[PDB]
Structure 1
Amino acid sequence: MTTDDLAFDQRHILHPYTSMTSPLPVYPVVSAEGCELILSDGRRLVDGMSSWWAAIHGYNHPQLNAAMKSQIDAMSHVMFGGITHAPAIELCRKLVAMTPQPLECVFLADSGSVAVEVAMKMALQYWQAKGEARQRFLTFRNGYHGDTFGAMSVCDPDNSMHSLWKGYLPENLFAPAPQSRMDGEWDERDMVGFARLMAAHRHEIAAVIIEPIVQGAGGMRMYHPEWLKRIRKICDREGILLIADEIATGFGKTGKLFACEHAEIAPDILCLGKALTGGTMTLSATLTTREVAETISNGEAGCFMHGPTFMGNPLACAAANASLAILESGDWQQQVADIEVQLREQLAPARDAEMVADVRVLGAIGVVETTHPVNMAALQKFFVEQGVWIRPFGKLIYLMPPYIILPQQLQRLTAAVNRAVQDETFFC
């Protein structure tokens, strides 16, 4: 990669949520292996982000590589319309078996936002088929479910700047963000807001949608499992569908295979992505119950009205399959368990740093919330200089490393966070 290459990227290439007139620096990666990213100039970085929570087995994993190459030898892609294939079947087999019992119907798709759109469409078509006028969604503040129109309609209105689309997006119901902590105690006062909304709109609510236990992009919040129990039961009593968006929490990240396990509940609709493929390429899945799948198919439309061009992509399914196989060994439990203890122990000190507001850890997720917003360009440069890859945002410096990280590598990550928050150099 030359500097002419980099100039082209700056001038012509949009990146996620970032200015085109005032872009900040981006770092050129040429390769990756184990828990390391390798920059154009040869510098090696310990990855603390797992490429946004997806690369749970790291990079250039032998088993993922072998699976992907063997699938390329067979066929990289074939359409799913009237056709099925081994990688899709094996993948759906594992997904059904590894999730609660009632979730036995799988809709594969290409990205997490699309998986959410699917869930929402499933809920609307379900009620339409039942003859009930239910088109509203009840969600939590601080939630994040994707960037498409429907997914945006259930994202935190303030976080996502809904004023930009005021009049275009449908207006849903927003209960207050859950206050009780995953670490701490339950407080029944937490429920009043949600109960008042349910009492007033019970008759028009299509589904309740939330991220179980951990609210990711909306604040790295970690709330009490009692919430899911309460919600599940309310939805049960009222007949309302429950959608669990586990695109970020799925596949071992919070200490359990699926965060719903922390509450011992099952949603009617389950959304999966990110770590599904071991972070090799995009893929998503939405699982539901027989009751939902059949009810939809029996309505006016005769089917679930959705079907993306690359639905069931073999290459991505094979990668996903190999990822799940690594997990079946059960090794991830001990790895995550150990990462959780090392994160609690090594981020604890940051609680005393002046720029820190809170420190929370769950599974392989370690968060340092600061009092002021970070200086993006300066802090990013700092992490790179320390030989680590950490990508902060707003007031959140967080780590979510591959499960195969070595204690020495993890220690390099925690050391870097602790050093970043020791004064105001990199803030505002």
Structure 2
Amino acid sequence: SALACSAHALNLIEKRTLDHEEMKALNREVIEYFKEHVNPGFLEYRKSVTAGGDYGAVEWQAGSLNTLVDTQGQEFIDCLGGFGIFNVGHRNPVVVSAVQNQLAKQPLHSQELLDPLRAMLAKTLAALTPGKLKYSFFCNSGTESVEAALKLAKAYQSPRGKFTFIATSGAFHGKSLGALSATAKSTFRKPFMPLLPGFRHVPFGNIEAMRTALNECKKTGDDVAAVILEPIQGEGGVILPPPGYLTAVRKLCDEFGALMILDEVQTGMGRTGKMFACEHENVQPDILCLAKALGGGVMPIGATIATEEVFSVLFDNPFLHTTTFGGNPLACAAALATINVLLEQNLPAQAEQKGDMLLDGFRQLAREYPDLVQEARGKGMLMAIEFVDNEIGYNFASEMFRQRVLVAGTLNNAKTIRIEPPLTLTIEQCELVIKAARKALAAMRQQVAFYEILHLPNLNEEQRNAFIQSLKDDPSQSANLLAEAKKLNDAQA
């Protein structure tokens, strides 16, 4: 019965530790259900099952601020941070109690009485945001964030006869039909077409291009309502735009009277060094999208902050754009807690020193294995290593998973991996990571070399065997023996 299934899951919430067969039990239901009620695919493409072991790595509870412990007790260092969620770490004590307090009083609002925390957050965000960004709208996610932004721009610009929206190729903005009209990857968009009419993509980091789009549209009577872009393409592979770009986009917008929308969903809340990435070039957008880390990894939340000139649209009919759960008290709680922590222990500043020590650490590794890595890149605690193959990439992401270091990448989309550990990552865990990636890079180089030695056609078995022998006895020579085998295979060529 559903009554049955509810209770069994209800008692498991209460349980805090597990007998080894209580574990086995669990992991087998959880795989069983994932296959029959969730998606069977996540069992196919995820690194938690491929490299799971005998059992998958089913989540259990948070370890420290930076660690995660599965149902077997294995503790993982999070260098994923839920793709930019866990900026203040897992269960940050300051956020968890702000939530638990608010939970004692009133978790959600009535929707009729002026709820106080939504004012306080709207206020704080006004304070925290650059230039004339004043009004906040509150939703539940990063996609609802962008949607409302699109709606604001729309309601603003359509009376002025402007309907077209420029977005950028490689841009991600959300999976809901409205945001998916601005999101750019082929794969994500094609099945659900036709999407919103009038969304046109230009290359990212290309101001010369965006002028031509804004101008062509002008000429043909399809004038641009708004331009929407991320400060850094996060999912897009940690693409950094050319210095001056965001500033130059900002003028270009101002020149053509087009609203500028900044999707700071993955670069907001101090990840890139500054509280908002658009502060590195000190650029003020007309609209700013926030989410993910705004909810301190405790709560889900999305905020849309805009200038007064733009948010005015909603003033005369405030019900034009509502949401049911948006701005609920205990989500509010969470953010104010997160906003407080970020300014107190001043973690944007931490983001920049840990963010360069790490990244440098990776582009060093990247010089030492140019045969497995094209490049590493990032800005503050948002960074990514680009491998040569998805084969290799998924092999890196997977290898370290076993070294109990949790990074990105799935079975297929894995050519470039992303490193996004909490901003609260210690200097001790910082090395432990670059160390783990060095071991990982060694072992892969071993395997890569290993095959290389085998299809050497001119090389005979007698010689090949000598190399394979010294390879296993000395994996350090994986590069030397290789060169010696290739040099030998060419000798008999």
Structure 1 residue 157 displacement after superposition: 4.1
How many residues were matched structurally?
405
Which moved further from structure 2: 272-281 or 358-367?
Answer: 358-367
Q: Does 1:405 align with 2:425?
A: yes
Q: Does 1:140 align with 2:168?
A: yes
Greater per-residue helix proportion: 2
5+ long unaligned stretches in structure 1: 179-189
CA distance in 1, matches of 2:128, 2:308: 17
* Residues 372-391 of structure 1 mapped to structure 2, 5 A cutoff: 372-374=389-391, 379-391=396-408
Question: Are residues 283 and 211 of structure 1, via their aligned partners in 2, closer, same or farther at CA, if it must alter by over 3 Å?
Answer: same
From 351, 355, 364, the equivalent of 1:340 is: 355
CA distance in 2, matches of 1:361, 1:401: 12
Q: Does 1:109 align with 2:129?
A: no
Question: Are residues 276 and 377 of structure 1, via their aligned partners in 2, closer, same or farther at CA, if it must alter by over 3 Å?
Answer: same
Structure 1 residue 142 displacement after superposition: 0.8
Query: TM-score if structure 2 supplies the norm length?
Result: 0.77
From 41, 52, 55, the equivalent of 1:19 is: 41
From 308, 331, 336, the equivalent of 2:346 is: 331
Note the alpha carbon deviations across 1:309-357, whole angstroms, 9 max, x for none: 1111111111111111111225214311220231133112232211111
The answer to whether the 8 A contact 1:355-1:371 is kept is yes
**Post-superposition, which runs of at least 4 consecutive aligned residues in structure 1 deviate over 6 A?**
none
| Alignment-mate amino acid for residue 327 of structure 1 | L
CA distance in 2, matches of 1:54, 1:162: 24
From 288, 294, 301, the equivalent of 1:276 is: 294
| Structure with the greater alpha carbon radius of gyration | 2
CA RMSD for the aligned pairs? 2.2
CA distance in 1, matches of 2:42, 2:363: 38
3-state SS of 1:401 partner: coil
Note the alpha carbon deviations across 1:144-182, whole angstroms, 9 max, x for none: 000000111111143x4433234344351111122xxxx
Note the alpha carbon deviations across 1:279-316, whole angstroms, 9 max, x for none: 11210100111111224545xxx346221111111111
| Alignment-mate amino acid for residue 431 of structure 2 | Q
| Alignment-mate amino acid for residue 14 of structure 1 | V
| Alignment-mate amino acid for residue 206 of structure 1 | A
The equivalent of 2:437 in structure 1 is 417
| Alignment-mate amino acid for residue 423 of structure 2 | Y
CA distance in 2, matches of 1:362, 1:350: 18
3-state SS of 1:83 partner: coil
The equivalent of 2:273 in structure 1 is 255
Question: Are residues 267 and 168 of structure 1, via their aligned partners in 2, closer, same or farther at CA, if it must alter by over 3 Å?
Answer: closer
From 22, 27, 30, the equivalent of 2:60 is: 30
Q: Does 1:56 align with 2:75?
A: no
The answer to whether the 8 A contact 1:246-1:270 is kept is yes
The equivalent of 2:27 in structure 1 is 3
| Alignment-mate amino acid for residue 173 of structure 1 | R
| Alignment-mate amino acid for residue 41 of structure 2 | S
The answer to whether the 8 A contact 1:109-1:285 is kept is yes
3-state SS of 1:360 partner: strand
| Alignment-mate amino acid for residue 133 of structure 1 | G
The equivalent of 1:265 in structure 2 is 283
1 or 2 for the larger relative contact order (CA 8 Å, sep ≥6)?
Answer: 1
The equivalent of 2:211 in structure 1 is 195
The equivalent of 2:379 in structure 1 is 362
Q: Does 1:162 align with 2:162?
A: no
CA distance in 1, matches of 2:149, 2:177: 13
Structure 1 residue 92 displacement after superposition: 1.7
The answer to whether the 8 A contact 1:109-1:308 is kept is yes
Q: Does 1:218 align with 2:233?
A: no
The equivalent of 1:394 in structure 2 is 414
CA distance in 2, matches of 1:147, 1:154: 10
Question: Are residues 94 and 296 of structure 1, via their aligned partners in 2, closer, same or farther at CA, if it must alter by over 3 Å?
Answer: closer
Q: Does 1:243 align with 2:270?
A: no
Query: TM-score if structure 1 supplies the norm length?
Result: 0.88
5+ long unaligned stretches in structure 2: 1-22, 50-55, 449-493
Structure 1 residue 11 displacement after superposition: 1.3
The answer to whether the 8 A contact 1:366-1:400 is kept is yes
3-state SS of 2:160 partner: coil
Note the alpha carbon deviations across 1:159-208, whole angstroms, 9 max, x for none: x4433234344351111122xxxxxxxxxxx4322221111113521100
The answer to whether the 8 A contact 2:172-2:185 is kept is no
Between the aligned residues of both structures, percent identity stands at 28
The answer to whether the 8 A contact 1:349-1:418 is kept is no
Structure 1 residue 109 displacement after superposition: 0.4
